[PDB]
Design a protein around this ligand. Structure first.
Ligand SMILES: Cc1cc2nc3c(=O)[nH]c(=O)nc-3n(C[C@H](O)[C@H](O)[C@H](O)COP(=O)(O)O)c2cc1C
Ligand code: SF4
Ligand code: SF4
Ligand code: SF4
Ligand code: SF4
Ligand code: SF4
Ligand code: FES
Ligand code: FES
Ligand SMILES: [Zn+2]
Lengths: 210, 29, 87, 263, 424, 83, 106, 80, 26
């Protein structure tokens, strides 16, 4: 949680919101209450992350500058949240959920598959710089337990084979099917569903009088 | 089915439908 | 925890009243400490009278003087606190 | 009017509205044990070493924080508010590095005493301890911050009494370290007060590193001559040479703080 | 039990347009103006009579909660905060509402504000869900276009401006006082409760926080009346709730079934059945990781409603059912939940910071079996020190799974103790 | 001369004492002895330092050899540890 | 064993000395470590209670076995750090054996 | 931060010479009443001790911390 | 197991250091 000057990451590293980015930045500012800009540090810090994954010390300094807050204030926000990365990350940053729901259903095996294909251990980045694996905690979407969020893709209900296959598409080509890869309709019961069979009731159906 | 800047850009658009926000009345907390 | 015997705490308390009634005149305070010890406090004039009653009373014979000492509380107007311990 | 009547164990100390549980204990005469609360620093509730038990209430309350209400009885020496301190002190000590014969806040520790008085006789932390990395906060304050009980007094003083707003918390979990994210020295007047205000000896004075130990220091109360505010100060002398000058409280002139120059 | 005719959320599992056109077809935004016209009072009577309990981690009577910030404005704008952070492990409950039936949320927020005079509401969807929010954002844009939201909503004079705030991967952000601070832009560390959120909240203005399910059901309840909702349940735990079943079961799914239904029935009628036969149930986690797990003999006897669970010593919570077959090392299952909490608690308070790390170290040794048998009740005592002393509830939450493992599975942990001692 | 180089001086009025009697000073000064001690390489981020021998050592402390930039030095033994 | 003197100048041996015998003043050695510039046991003041042996956390000050140190002059009895360190080096082998035998008891 | 040593009044005699000792460098004092600090419960009683013993006295009024108003809610005020 | 008198002295340093008069005459 400490930063040390290094040529690759220093205030020297250049960072400035693209003319387009700066536009975005203000959009954030007015969404928040007037006279309140500090509240936008996170959303902004997020766009610095959108700009560049590394988000070096220089980038946080700019965020504080644009948002006119104590610089530390930005440093504290970046350190507290895992969403922000203070180190460069690979192109994909595959994040495997390895907590109880996912542990159940063998998320670890998926992790193993991922590690094997990437030929890298969890918490390590391929030299290709396209893949970075991390064992993240509950990412929501548990009904579909096997799971691996990739830059929000949030693939779900995946069996080990599917995982490698997904990596294949990413390794060389377009992205795999955003979302789960199973027969279940969303989070409907695996084989079909036993609820909500009736057609949607009409507007005003059984509306309490007045 | 969304690019990284889908949300923020959408939010920029949402501005056409928002009242001027209120303020505490100070330069900075 | 020390092995307190309430049997004592009571008997000594009862004697403390006994003495307080027998010599209303000089006894100012009487208390049996939680350490099972009685410490009648007397006006300085009652030195002779209170001791003599304890040395020569059938229901309270206190024949030997274990010690005579004087703590000094400088704050206290009466600096010294002569303490006589009797058996 | 404006005199809430609350019973501190039955003393019915009538206090003004907004009096915190701790403040009532002070008035009645008691002093609730406390790590994160300083009178002239904002209430933070970080340590929760002050948990007390208002009568007829399910949970114990944070003294420094709960505004006392009407009819409450702040049972302080209950069988509960002692398990609420015997069990917190278990935690502060668990991750603590026992280098008390290095910590020059040896006899000046509000954490050993509170342990010796509101803590337990023995430890059960058979697991391992943590360690943080000593950094440089400047040439006056030696931050051996593996000592820090994350009480956030510094981050307050450094923002509220002095306007430095540099020191801050970094991270979450048991490796929240309260040190400057980038190594920028804490350069400001009023800087040395952090020493006096950190009850732990994590960051202490570097010149007065290891020259003495507080029981020995004979303490003579005198006046600051370096500046014209005439701040009250206590000169701590051992065997005839001054070893340290630390503030002594004067409501009107220096209320518990002294300049970097005059110490 | 529950009929499709009698269902609050009627667009689950998609299959239908999540957009306004489809939502309108389904019957959303019905006489919304009339509802607002009924007046804030009328809405809270509805919620009160409804007996709608908070669908969040802890259920507080919705009516009372909303009522508090119904006191007259003191010149600070009142606000609405809707927590769309699906932090609780095992809970995909809320994600469904936004992803599939978002417009219901939008109207709910509007109805929500009318109930409490919030100029605006901010929805904190967890940043993890980037895809989810965009959809919600889109729907909101449409509603503004429709006039549904914005100035003179639905023509009704009320002005409401809804927002969406990015979460940043923190379970604690979910906490009521901490959601605010993240909204405020400071570090997400729960503030204390004594100045309650109503009195002081986001941006120091009157504020109220609701589980997204709680905000979503308020319009349907308002339109369909309090009694309807009241009838489906018993006493306080009265209402329709989305229950999720994840783990060791034939078909994991978010049913939406009515409340107070037998645990067995819920996992029986829906969820297929316990994978490997009901008897292959080492334990059930009813409300998610925070609530204590209940072992099999207690479970079918008990049913899923908050009153029944508190009798059982467990919490309905997010009603996330996590099931563990006899094929799982519970000592390690609960151990990762303590690992789930050491990687996540803010560290603001002393009891949670060191205590949760202390239990994590002991729990890891317990899984190995290195620790001696006497240490097991030691963790009992460490557990309650954390339970009543923490600034927020997460320390409350960390202690309960530990307490459950010792309470019902004490013999198994002793054997793991024994197993290591034997091989030396 | 000595550890902290005590040097009653050519002009002091105390150097008179050693006349016809030697001074007590130390060879193998400690100041240089630990400097002569090799840096204990370790694998773990943090390491202990019983001082060697447990009860017969120093109160055990855990040192953070986390930065190769600095070899942690237990405040008690002056032993540098090389990550 | 490395050669670094055990004392780290916590100075509680001075605190618990019943006779006021031990005088300790310290300053950070250039190494940055904490060491005693002056450690003076006045043996004539000392009543050989052995509490200093007890009190030391690093157990730097020990009651050594030798009892035969009678001296012609009073000054010789006053002992500075160099005499005690020299006394320590001479008797370290037996002191180590003695502490080895009795530490379980303590 | 403990206040149990700021309760009882103490009267302390004026400090005197503390010259270094030539043989060992120990501090040496010629003033007998130096280390003596008597503790008195109330200001009136301490003044009495000085008068009957004939020592000159210069009493300093107790200064106790002024009541300070604190409330966790107050700092959460963005306004101020 | 199969002239040398210890002269006592203070090992501390000068402490208070006085101001050397300027050797430059004025
Ligand atoms: C550590 C922690 C995490 C929480 N996470 C969530 C969450 O993700 N979603 C949520 O609705 N409530 C969460 N809560 C509970 C909220 O603080 C609050 O009590 C609840 O959202 C109120 O909603 P309701 O009034 O609709 O029940 C959490 C509480 C704690 C202590
Ligand atoms: S702070 Fe220094 S003194 Fe107080 S306990 Fe921790 S180490 Fe011992
Ligand atoms: S440094 Fe001292 S003051 Fe600052 S937090 Fe750590 S302990 Fe509290
Ligand atoms: S319990 Fe204390 S530490 Fe854990 S989250 Fe709530 S506040 Fe932060
Ligand atoms: S001898 Fe032992 S006790 Fe006396 S100072 Fe040196 S270390 Fe501390
Ligand atoms: S033995 Fe150690 S402690 Fe006892 S008197 Fe001599 S020096 Fe002081
Ligand atoms: S635990 Fe992995 S998503 Fe629920
Ligand atoms: S003093 Fe009460 S919480 Fe720290
Ligand atoms: Zn060591």
């Amino acid at each position: 949680f400490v930063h040390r000057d290094t040529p690759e990451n220093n205030p020297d590293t250049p960072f400035d919101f693209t003319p387009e980015n700066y536009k975005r930045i203000e959009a954030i500012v007015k969404n928040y209450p007037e006279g309140h800009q500090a509240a936008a540090v996170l959303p902004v810090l997020d766009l610095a992350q959108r700009q560049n994954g590394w988000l070096p010390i220089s980038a946080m300094n700019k965020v504080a500058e644009v948002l006119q807050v104590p610089p530390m204030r930005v440093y504290e926000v970046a350190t507290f949240y895992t969403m922000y990365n203070r180190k460069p990350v690979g192109k994909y940053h595959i994040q495997v959920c390895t907590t109880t729901p996912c542990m159940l259903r063998d998320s670890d095996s998926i992790l193993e598959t991922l590690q094997r294909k990437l030929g890298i251990k969890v918490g390590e980045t391929t030299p290709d710089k396209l893949f970075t694996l991390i064992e993240v905690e509950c990412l929501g979407a548990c009904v579909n337990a096997p799971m691996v969020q990739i830059n929000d893709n949030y693939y779900e209900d995946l069996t080990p084979k599917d995982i490698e296959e997904i990596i294949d598409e990413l390794k060389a080509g377009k992205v795999p099917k955003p979302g789960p890869r199973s027969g279940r309709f969303c989070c409907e019961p695996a084989g079909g569903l036993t609820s909500l069979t009736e057609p949607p009731k009409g507007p005003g159906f059984g509306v309490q009088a007045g | 089915d969304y690019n990284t800047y889908t949300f923020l850009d959408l939010n920029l658009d949402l501005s056409k439908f928002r009242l001027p926000q209120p303020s505490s009345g100070r330069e900075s907390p | 925890v020390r092995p307190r015997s309430d049997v004592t705490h009571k008997q000594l308390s009862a004697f403390g009243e006994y003495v307080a009634e027998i010599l209303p005149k000089y006894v100012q305070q009487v208390q049996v400490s939680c350490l099972d010890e009685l410490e009648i406090c007397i006006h300085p004039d009652g030195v002779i009278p209170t001791l003599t009653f304890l040395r020569d009373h059938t229901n309270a014979q206190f024949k030997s003087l274990a010690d005579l000492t004087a703590v000094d509380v400088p704050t206290r107007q009466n600096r010294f606190e002569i303490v006589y311990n009797l058996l | 009017s404006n005199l809430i009547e609350v019973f501190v164990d039955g003393q019915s100390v009538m206090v003004e509205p907004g009096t915190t549980v701790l403040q009532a204990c002070e008035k009645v005469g008691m002093q609730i044990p406390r790590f994160c609360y300083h009178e002239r620093l904002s209430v933070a509730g970080n340590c929760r070493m002050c948990l007390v038990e208002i009568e007829k209430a399910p949970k114990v309350v944070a003294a420094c924080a709960m505004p006392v209400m009407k009819g409450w009885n702040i049972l302080t020496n209950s069988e509960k508010s002692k398990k609420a301190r015997e069990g917190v002190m278990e935690f502060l000590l668990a991750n603590h590095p026992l280098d008390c014969p290095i910590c020059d806040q040896g006899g000046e520790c509000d954490l050993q005493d509170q342990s010796m008085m509101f803590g337990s006789d023995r430890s059960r932390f058979l697991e391992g301890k943590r360690a943080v990395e000593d950094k440089n906060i400047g040439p006056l304050v030696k931050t051996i911050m593996t000592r820090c009980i994350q009480c956030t007094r510094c981050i307050r003083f450094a923002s509220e009494i002095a306007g430095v707003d540099d020191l801050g918390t970094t991270g979450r979990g048991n490796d929240m370290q309260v040190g400057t994210y980038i190594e920028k020295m804490f350069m400001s007047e009023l800087s040395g007060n952090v020493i006096d205000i950190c009850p732990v000896g994590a960051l202490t004075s570097k010149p007065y590193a290891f020259t003495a130990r507080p029981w020995e220091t004979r303490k003579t109360e005198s006046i600051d001559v370096m500046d014209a505010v005439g701040s009250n100060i206590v000169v701590s002398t051992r065997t005839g040479e001054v070893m340290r000058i630390l503030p002594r409280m004067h409501e009107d002139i220096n209320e518990e703080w002294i300049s970097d120059k005059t110490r | 039990s529950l009929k499709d005719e009698d269902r609050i959320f009627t667009n689950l599992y998609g299959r239908h347009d999540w957009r306004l056109k489809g939502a309108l077809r389904r019957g959303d935004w019905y006489k919304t103006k009339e509802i607002l016209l009924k007046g804030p009072d009328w809405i809270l009577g509805e919620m009160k009579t409804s007996g709608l309990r908070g669908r969040g981690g802890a259920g507080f009577p919705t009516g009372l909660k909303w009522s508090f910030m119904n006191k007259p404005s003191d010149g600070r704008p009142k606000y609405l905060v809707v927590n769309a952070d699906e932090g609780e492990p095992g809970t995909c409950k809320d994600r469904e509402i936004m992803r599939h039936d978002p417009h219901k949320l939008v109207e709910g927020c509007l109805v929500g504000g009318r109930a409490m005079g919030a100029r605006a509401a901010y929805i904190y969807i967890r940043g993890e869900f980037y895809n989810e929010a965009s959809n919600l954002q889109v729907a909101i844009r449409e509603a503004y276009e429709a006039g549904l939201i914005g100035k003179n909503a639905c023509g009704s004079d009320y002005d409401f401006d809804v927002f969406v705030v990015r979460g940043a991967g923190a379970y604690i952000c979910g906490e009521e006082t901490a959601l605010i601070e993240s909204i405020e832009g400071k570090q997400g560390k729960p503030r204390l409760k004594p100045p309650f959120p109503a009195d002081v909240g986001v941006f120091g203005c009157p504020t109220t926080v609701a589980n997204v399910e709680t905000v979503a059901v308020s319009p349907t309840i308002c339109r369909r009346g309090g009694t309807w909702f009241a009838g489906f349940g018993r006493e306080r735990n009265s209402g329709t709730k989305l229950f999720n079943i994840s783990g060791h079961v034939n078909h994991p799914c978010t049913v939406e079934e009515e409340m107070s239904v037998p645990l067995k029935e819920l996992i029986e009628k829906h969820a297929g059945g316990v994978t490997g036969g009901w008897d292959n149930l080492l334990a059930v986690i009813p409300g998610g990781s925070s609530t204590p797990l209940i072992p099999k003999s207690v479970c079918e006897t008990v049913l899923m409603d908050f009153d029944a669970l508190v009798q059982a010593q467990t919490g309905l919570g997010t009603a996330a059912v996590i099931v563990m077959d006899r094929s799982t090392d519970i000592v390690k299952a609960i151990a990762r939940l303590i690992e789930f909490y050491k990687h996540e608690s803010c560290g603001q308070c002393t009891p949670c910071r060191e205590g949760v790390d202390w239990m994590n170290k002991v729990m890891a040794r317990f899984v190995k079996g290195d620790a001696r048998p006497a240490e097991i009740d030691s963790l009992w005592e460490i557990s309650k020190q954390i339970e009543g002393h923490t600034i927020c509830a997460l320390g409350d939450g960390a202690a309960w799974p530990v307490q459950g493992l010792i309470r019902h599975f004490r013999p198994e942990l002793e054997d793991r103790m024994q197993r290591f001692a034997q091989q030396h | 001369i000595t550890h902290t180089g005590q040097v009653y001086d050519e002009k002091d009025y105390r150097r008179v004492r050693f006349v016809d009697r030697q001074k007590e000073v130390n060879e193998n000064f400690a100041i240089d002895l630990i400097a002569q001690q090799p840096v204990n390489e370790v694998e773990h981020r943090i390491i202990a330092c019983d001082g060697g021998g447990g009860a017969l050592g120093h109160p055990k402390v855990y040192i953070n050899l986390d930065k190769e930039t600095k070899t942690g030095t237990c405040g008690y033994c002056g032993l540098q540890f090389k990550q | 064993p490395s050669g670094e003197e055990r004392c780290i100048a916590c100075k509680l041996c001075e605190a618990i000395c019943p006779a006021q015998a031990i005088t300790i003043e310290a300053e950070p050695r250039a190494d940055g470590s904490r060491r005693t510039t002056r450690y003076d046991i006045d043996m004539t003041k000392c009543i050989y209670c052995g509490f200093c042996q007890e009190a030391c956390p690093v157990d730097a000050i020990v009651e050594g076995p030798n009892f035969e140190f009678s001296t012609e002059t009073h000054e010789e009895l006053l002992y500075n750090k160099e005499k005690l360190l020299n006394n320590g080096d001479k008797w370290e082998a037996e002191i180590a054996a003695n502490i080895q035998a009795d530490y379980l008891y303590r | 931060s403990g206040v149990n040593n700021t309760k009882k009044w103490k009267m302390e005699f004026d400090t005197r010479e503390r010259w270094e000792n030539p043989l060992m460098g120990w501090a040496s004092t010629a003033d007998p009443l130096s280390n003596m600090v008597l503790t008195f419960s109330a200001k009136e009683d301490a003044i009495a001790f000085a008068e009957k013993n004939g020592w000159s006295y210069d009493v300093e009024e107790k200064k106790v911390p002024k009541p300070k108003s604190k409330s966790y809610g107050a700092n959460f005020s963005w306004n101020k | 197991p199969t002239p040398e008198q210890y002269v006592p002295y203070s090992t501390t340093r000068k402490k208070i250091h006085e101001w050397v008069p300027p050797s430059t005459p004025y």
